[PDB]
Amino acid sequence: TLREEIDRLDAEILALVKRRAEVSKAIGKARMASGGTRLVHSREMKVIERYSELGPDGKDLAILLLRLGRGRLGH
Template sequence: MPDTTGVPADDTLTEQQILSYRDEINELDAEILRLIKRRSEVSQRVGRARMAAGGPRIVYNREMTVLNKFGELGTDGRELGMILLRLGRGRLGGR
């Protein structure tokens, strides 16, 4: 009888392997969060310095470069890039 689950037979994992992958995912998530927080801090610092020097709040060509890079992941990647840009802007004009 043919397999109708859509999962190739060679992708069969034991419960222990699944748990191991989940542990790795949890570690990756923690690292991603750490990096996003750091990226936001650095971006906000650059933005504050740029504005203090009389520069623009947003540098659109820089943002387009970021969006194009994340666009390599498709539509969701561009959305992720937009979220990162928003996080990085912070409250540039406020306190």
């Protein structure tokens, strides 16, 4: 039944990560439409600091969320 929860808990993570990728893209278009830059360095550090509670792996999760949000650099 703990295995049954992890299944649900993964479905919810997957859904929120999908939603974050949309909302992040939307902020990107909005900032660029207003004459701003796709990437903003200070904001990426805020996302990284936000996941630090997960430990050393927190920053890797953050960077992955930023990659789903904007895209690969240079592309």
